[PDB]
């Protein structure tokens, strides 16, 4: 973790993050054997085993019914559309009877079997037999003459356990029209997610990373329903494949640079905020807010979202004051007072009418902040205050620098008309 404050545009770059970025998908297809419940009958009036069995029958019938510029919005749109279309394209193959029989056949005796689909994609199959096993071995033995109010209630309450996984999956597909937003524990256990990583074709290093960040693997991946085949419910889990890893990533963040250049204000905000990464030979920008998140020094992002942006674009950080690159900005007569909690220091914007201060848990007010932009490091203060709000600063330790330069809002005259503009290049605005 390292950070730089760009005085010349009231902005910070936080550098030194490693990267984990999703380049691909590994499909894991689950054969959960529900067993042929559809004609199991209880001839015995309302009972625990009956109502579990009837919920189990109903869940199966229900599941048979269900089946599948502003850079931020476009990046969000493509990231979801590409991800689901990747999985559907796999679903289209494995739904074929040739493939369902192939998957079920290799699962006949081993609860994990690798296979190659007719469409050439390779998939790990696994079999969640435990429900069919309980129904066929355990439950069928205990039921006699179709009676289900049997007194050995341990059978009933244990049945209400073994079917929990199945029922939660029928929920999660039904509520999401066959495309779940995340891999619930019910689609793929932590044991099976560890197996899926250990079996996937990636480096032991990435395996150890993924074994250390299993929640990330779970959060970025998602599930698709293939269908009920012969009283068996077929569904596929896509785990992420992180084929670019520990490359440089940085987050650019900014707050309104303003000055009273004519007694009336002028202001500027950098629009290019968010995560940038070196993606093996070009910089990629991740503008959609759902794309990137950080666990530790890694940022985890999805390469389908990333708008590829020229390597020259970093020159907005070094010299937006002079660069020929069209740095995307907003400007206008709109002084806003705010803080941006960049991880090694809060940015502050502090303008007319708004009193500003910084403090500590012990010392009280350290200082009244000046008019203008300010950069309060994690070590300068514990709190910053604007108007009467209290903002708690981050307490992360790390190197900070200031790049000096009279802010763009102060070193250029604003264009007299149109003085307000949204998401324009600076060349248009000053």
């Amino acid at each position: 973790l390292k950070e730089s404050y760009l005085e010349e545009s009231c902005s910070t770059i936080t550098e030194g993050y490693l990267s984990v970025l999703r380049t691909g998908w590994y499909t894991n297809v689950f054969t959960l054997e529900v067993g042929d419940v559809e004609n199991l009958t209880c001839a015995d009036g309302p009972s625990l085993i009956k109502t579990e069995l009837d919920l189990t029958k109903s869940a199966l019938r229900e599941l048979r019914t269900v089946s599948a510029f502003v850079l931020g919005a476009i990046a969000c749109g493509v990231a979801t559309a590409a991800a689901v279309t990747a999985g559907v394209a796999i679903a289209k193959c494995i739904r074929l009877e040739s493939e369902v029989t192939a998957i079920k056949n290799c699962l006949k005796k081993t609860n994990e079997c690798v296979s190659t689909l007719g469409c050439g994609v390779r998939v790990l199959a696994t079999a969640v037999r435990e429900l069919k096993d309980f129904v066929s071995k355990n439950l069928t033995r205990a039921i006699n003459k179709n009676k289900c109010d049997i007194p050995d209630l341990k059978m009933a309450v244990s049945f209400s356990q073994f079917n929990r996984r199945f029922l939660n999956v029928v929920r999660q597909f039904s509520d999401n029209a066959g495309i779940t937003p995340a891999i619930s524990k019910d689609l793929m256990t932590d044991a099976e997610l560890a197996r899926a990583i250990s079996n996937m074709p990636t480096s032991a290093g990435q395996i150890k990373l993924m074994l250390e960040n299993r929640a990330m693997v779970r959060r970025k991946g998602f599930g698709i329903l293939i269908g009920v085949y012969g009283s068996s419910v077929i569904y596929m889990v896509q785990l992420p494949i992180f084929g670019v890893i520990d490359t440089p990533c940085w987050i650019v963040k900014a707050a309104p640079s303003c000055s009273e250049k004519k007694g009336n204000y002028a202001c500027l905000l950098r629009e290019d905020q968010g995560w940038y990464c070196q993606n093996a030979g070009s910089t990629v920008y991740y503008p959609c807010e759902k794309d990137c998140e950080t666990r530790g020094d890694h940022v985890f992002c999805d390469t389908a979202a990333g708008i590829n942006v020229a390597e020259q674009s970093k020159e907005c950080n070094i010299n937006i004051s002079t660069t020929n690159y069209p740095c995307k900005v907003s400007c206008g007569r709109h002084p806003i007072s705010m803080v941006a909690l960049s991880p090694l220091g809060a940015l502050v914007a502090c303008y007319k009418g708004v009193s500003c201060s910084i403090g500590s848990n012990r010392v009280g007010i350290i200082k009244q902040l000046n008019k203008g932009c300010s950069y309060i490091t994690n070590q300068d203060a514990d709190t910053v205050t604007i108007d009467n709000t209290v903002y708690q600063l981050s307490k992360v330790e790390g190197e900070q620098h200031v790049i000096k330069g009279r802010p763009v809002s102060s070193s250029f005259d604003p264009v007299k008309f149109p003085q307000d503009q949204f998401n324009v290049a600076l060349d248009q605005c000053f």
Partner: nanobody
């Protein structure tokens, strides 16, 4: 659907008996189907021989378990009975019989019986 058999009608002692039963109009590999064999001399009462199920698991009548084996052929809708060594007592009519139970799979009533094949020893 009907089950059809074709002998051989005579097999000597110290020979392995085999019988086909052919069937059509139902898959063996749809759930809760079985085929079974059962045996009866004249003036005599019936003995189940073995059964094979939709998963090709198999069950052998305990007194005959020393001498019988039955399996579904992979290639086609036919089953072959095999039993190691005929004795004169094995002179009987043999039937293959279908059982189909989609509910709880315990209590196997048969519902269709073969055209029936005589064996003599």
């Amino acid at each position: 659907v009907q089950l059809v058999q074709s002998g051989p009608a005579l097999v000597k002692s110290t020979q392995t008996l085999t019988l086909t039963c052919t069937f059509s109009g139902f898959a063996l590999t749809t759930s809760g189907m079985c085929v079974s064999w059962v045996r009866q001399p004249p003036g005599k009462a019936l003995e189940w021989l073995a059964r094979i199920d939709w998963e090709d698991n198999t069950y052998y009548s305990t007194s005959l378990k020393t001498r019988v084996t039955i399996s579904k052929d992979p290639s086609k809708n036919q089953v072959v009975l095999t039993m190691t060594n005929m004795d004169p007592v094995d002179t009987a009519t043999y039937y293959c019989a279908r059982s189909y139970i989609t509910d709880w799979k315990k209590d196997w009533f048969f519902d269709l019986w073969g055209r029936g094949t005589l064996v003599t020893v």
